[PDB]
A paper describes a structure:
Chuangxinmycin (CXM) is a promising antimicrobial compound targeting bacterial tryptophanyl-tRNA synthetase (TrpRS), an essential enzyme in protein synthesis. TrpRS catalyzes the ligation of Trp to its cognate tRNA, forming tryptophanyl-tRNA (Trp-tRNA), which is required for the accurate translation of genetic codes into proteins. Structurally, CXM is a tryptophan (Trp) mimic but is characterized by a unique dihydrothiopyran heterocycle, which distinguishes it from other known antibiotics and contributes to its distinct physicochemical properties.
The structure of the EcTrpRS complex was solved at a resolution of 2.24 Å (ESI†). Specifically, the nitrogen atom of the indolyl group of CXM forms a hydrogen bond with the carboxyl group of D135 (corresponding to D132 in GsTrpRS, ESI†), and the carboxyl group of CXM forms a hydrogen bond with the phenol group of Y128 (corresponding to Y125 in GsTrpRS, ESI†) in both structures. Conserved residues F7, V42, H45, M132, I136, V144, and V146, located within 4 Å of the CXM carbon skeleton, engage in hydrophobic or π-stacking interactions with CXM (ESI†). After simulation, the ligand-binding pose in EcTrpRS/CXM system remained similar to the initial structure, with the hydrogen bond between the indolyl nitrogen atom and D135 carboxylate preserved. In contrast, under lower ATP concentrations, CXM alone can induce the “closed-gate” state of Y128 in the EcTrpRS/CXM complex, suggesting an alternative inhibitory phase.
Numbering used by the authors:
A (entry chain B): 2 to 335
B (entry chain A): 3 to 335
The structure:
Amino acid sequence: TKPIVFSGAQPSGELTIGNYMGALRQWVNMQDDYHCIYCIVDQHAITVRQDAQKLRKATLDTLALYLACGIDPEKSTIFVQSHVPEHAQLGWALNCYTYFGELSRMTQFKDKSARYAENINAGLFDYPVLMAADILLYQTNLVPVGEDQKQHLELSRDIAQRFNALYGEIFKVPEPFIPKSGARVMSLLEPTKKMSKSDDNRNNVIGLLEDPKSVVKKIKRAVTDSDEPPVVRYDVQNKAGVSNLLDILSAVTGQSIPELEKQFEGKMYGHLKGEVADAVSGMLTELQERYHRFRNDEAFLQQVMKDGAEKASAHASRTLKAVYEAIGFVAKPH
Amino acid sequence: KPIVFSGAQPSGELTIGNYMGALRQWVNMQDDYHCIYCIVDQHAITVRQDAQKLRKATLDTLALYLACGIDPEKSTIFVQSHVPEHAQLGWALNCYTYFGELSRMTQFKDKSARYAENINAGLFDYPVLMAADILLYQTNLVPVGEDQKQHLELSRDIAQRFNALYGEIFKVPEPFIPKSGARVMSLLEPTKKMSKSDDNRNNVIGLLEDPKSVVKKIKRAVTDSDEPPVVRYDVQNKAGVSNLLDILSAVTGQSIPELEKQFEGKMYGHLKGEVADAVSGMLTELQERYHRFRNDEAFLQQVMKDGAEKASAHASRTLKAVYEAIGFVAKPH
Ligand SMILES: Nc1ncnc2c1ncn2[C@@H]1O[C@H](COP(=O)(O)OC(=O)[C@@H](N)Cc2c[nH]c3ccccc23)[C@@H](O)[C@H]1O
Ligand SMILES: C[C@H]1c2c[nH]c3cccc(c23)S[C@H]1C(=O)O
């Protein structure tokens, strides 16, 4: 059997080119090489209060965006997290193998606390435990995520090792899979800030479903450096704006950074932003065409969801049963 | 007919105080209420312990409750982890519980008993799961002791806060106010009540102790320096003999005035010998039922299977409403 890939995305907010470049691109590319399981984490999404109607619609939006990106339900398991109760069950049990300090030192918890100071709920605190549960349920070897999930991923390796040290090889120790380029896509007008699916000025964000014409406008106004003379060179430290555009172009065309640096020799930033805008506008145009064919067929969306949850429950229930014996529960009679 | 919910810790070494107080009270009311008994194994693992012991004690608790008179035809008795809806609603209710509500918990600060970053998240999140245990079943009434009062109030707050956003999904549970009546005090500390959780096991008589062991603890029971020895009820100066008369009367039904006249001209040796004899007689009938249930592994399986199925039909109904209200896509059937 192949090694197992698992990853998740929240059906909340509008997914960005950062989501694509940090995770989704790798998800598509791994579907043949490994046994991939991809999840829409609706139980994580509600740690930030959401309108109920939007959340149900956003769940179908995310699923159709997966399919438009090229996730194939005949190659990959795709499901909605809450359709598989074993995520909640293992999430509870792993709470007991997680220290309070580990959760209270989490960068994402601190950032979300500041941003959502009226709703600092315990799900927001417990978030990494459920995410560890989503991963360890499937005997996962690889987790493709962006760089902002690395602390969370390292906790789930710790929890896996802690549990294994007590009860034997019940879990696999997962390994992160974070791309060397486009792991932290930066904001267009503030290239020191990661591009956030929660930004309150949309001029920083390229949405995957946003109007391509509005997207080209944002990329043309991307903030570049004041190097004299201007030079299209890759350097994340002192040329943040330029390098972020190079990453974004690379993710659209498939050309390497050094091939792109050669192609832009003797070229200035206005030509660079225009090439990025044309490349990105083209991919979003094709992406949104596939998106709508999938999104408007809800009975197809329902079929993918059902088949995926059934495929996922088979695997999760094997692990959860082994956890429950490890720890001492009486097994439920059948 | 009101729904009543109680969690049974599958690690409680239950005493005669539990049995003649709360348990006797509820065994006699299974037809007046729709009672639900949940052995909380998912709560237990918040304190690290031996896996085999936890498995055995879960079955001991079940057989002990059946021995005390819990009728699985009348009431619902089940094991928490056999109903996934507890963990599911437990996670969802996390998203509606303030971090501060959980950190201001005295039970969390007490059961902490160490430094944070050495206290597991199960100990921190414990109250939300209790809230989930209660609300899944549309519970009207919860019997709680003083140490569980703060937990129940959080449950009531969560229910109301959830209802205010989504509609009447949850029933707001109430405490069950009236007390059992039976008074059972600690054997060496006759001012404080006998508790299942005392680390001094000589203060208690457990439900499975043999008569030779019952005598040892009864004979060492604190009494008073009153000359001459008089067997008379008075809680301020005869608190010790007062406990023994209370325990005896709890066991036999005899009134305190009838007991006082029964022990007119008797000394403290006859009172303790009569207390131990009466306690051991009650415990002998209790234990023979316990061993009958506990060794019938097929009977226990059938009770767990029936209980969990009964619990799931109620639990899933509530959970489906919760998820629809929250806005999840419902699971394709
Ligand atoms: N600017 C950016 N540049 C590069 N990558 C980025 C950028 N912004 C976001 N990402 C990545 O996109 C993925 C989706 O993030 P979510 O917030 O939906 O989702 C999250 O942040 C997870 N907690 C969801 C989750 C729950 N359980 C899991 C188990 C495995 C993996 C993931 C999960 C993520 O990989 C994130 O790193
Ligand atoms: C057993 C524990 C428990 C778990 N779920 C519930 C629900 C109601 C009452 C209680 C509980 S009582 C409580 C305790 O700590 O006494």
